[PDB]
């Protein structure tokens, strides 16, 4: 299983980003003992799905803003506030 790092270009629409995040520093980890920010949901045919985001992706950066060590509220505010277009850097396990 390769750990790959991808850029995902999400265009915000009237339906938001079409994703959910779980985790964050100081919260219950989504995956093992890694309390980072993970994609827990992807809205079918939503902006994130069109851009190629997958559930289980770990969010590393948003438009160059690092959120690897963000707590949950920090990541929410970055994802809400920081652009009509969000270029996410994510890490993903690939077969």
């Amino acid at each position: 299983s390769r750990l790959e790092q991808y850029e995902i270009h999400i265009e915000r629409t009237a339906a938001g980003l079409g994703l959910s995040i779980a985790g964050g520093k100081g919260s219950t980890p989504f995956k093992g003992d890694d309390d980072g920010i993970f994609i827990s949901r992807v809205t079918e045919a939503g902006p994130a799905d069109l851009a190629g985001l997958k559930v289980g992706d770990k969010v590393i950066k948003v438009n160059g803003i690092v959120v690897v060590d963000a707590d949950h509220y920090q990541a929410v505010q970055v994802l809400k506030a920081c652009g009509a277009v969000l270029v996410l850097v994510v890490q993903r396990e690939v077969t």
Binding site: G16, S20, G24, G26, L79
Partner: peptide, 8 residues
Amino acid sequence: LPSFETAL
């Protein structure tokens, strides 16, 4: 610990 999930 909190268990947060936020739809966006």
